[PDB]
């Protein structure tokens, strides 16, 4: 497992506004804990699956 920005199949890291939205959405992502790294970024989990597809080196391209 590992921390990072959980991205859906499109490679889009879920965003957030508070820290509880990240911790929750994070638990669903299989992460133990997670907050919302604002700084113009998105949520942040801690415990995502190894293969857990997270922001790699591209942009959230729909389709």
UniProtKB/Swiss-Prot annotation:
Q: Which Pfam family, giving just one, matches this sequence?
A: Toxin_3
SUPFAM superfamilies given for it?
A: Scorpion toxin-like
Query: Which Gene Ontology terms of cellular component type are present?
Result: extracellular region
Could you tell me which residue ranges the LCN-type CS-alpha/beta domain spans? Answer: 2-61
Q: Which InterPro entries match?
A: LCN-type_CS_alpha_beta_dom, Scorpion_toxin-like, Scorpion_toxin-like_sf, Scorpion_toxinL, Scorpion_toxinL/defensin
Q: Which subcellular locations apply to this protein?
A: Secreted
Q: Which UniProt keywords apply?
A: Disulfide bond, Ion channel impairing toxin, Neurotoxin, Secreted, Toxin, Voltage-gated sodium channel impairing toxin
Q: Which GO terms describe its molecular function?
A: sodium channel inhibitor activity; toxin activity
Q: Give the superkingdom in one word.
A: Eukaryota
Q: In which tissues is it expressed?
A: Expressed by the venom gland.
Family, as annotated: Belongs to the long (4 C-C) scorpion toxin superfamily. Sodium channel inhibitor family. Alpha subfamily.
Entry text on domains: Has the structural arrangement of an alpha-helix connected to antiparallel beta-sheets by disulfide bonds (CS-alpha/beta).
Q: What is this protein called?
A: Alpha-toxin CsE5
Give the classification, highest ranks.
Eukaryota, Metazoa, Ecdysozoa, Arthropoda, Chelicerata
């Amino acid at each position: 497992k590992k921390d990072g920005y959980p991205v859906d199949s499109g490679n889009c890291k879920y965003e957030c506004l508070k820290d509880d939205y990240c911790n929750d959405l994070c638990l669903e992502r299989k992460a133990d804990k997670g907050y919302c790294y604002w700084g113009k970024v998105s949520c942040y989990c801690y415990g995502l699956p190894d293969n857990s597809p997270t922001k790699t080196s591209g942009k959230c391209n729909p389709a």
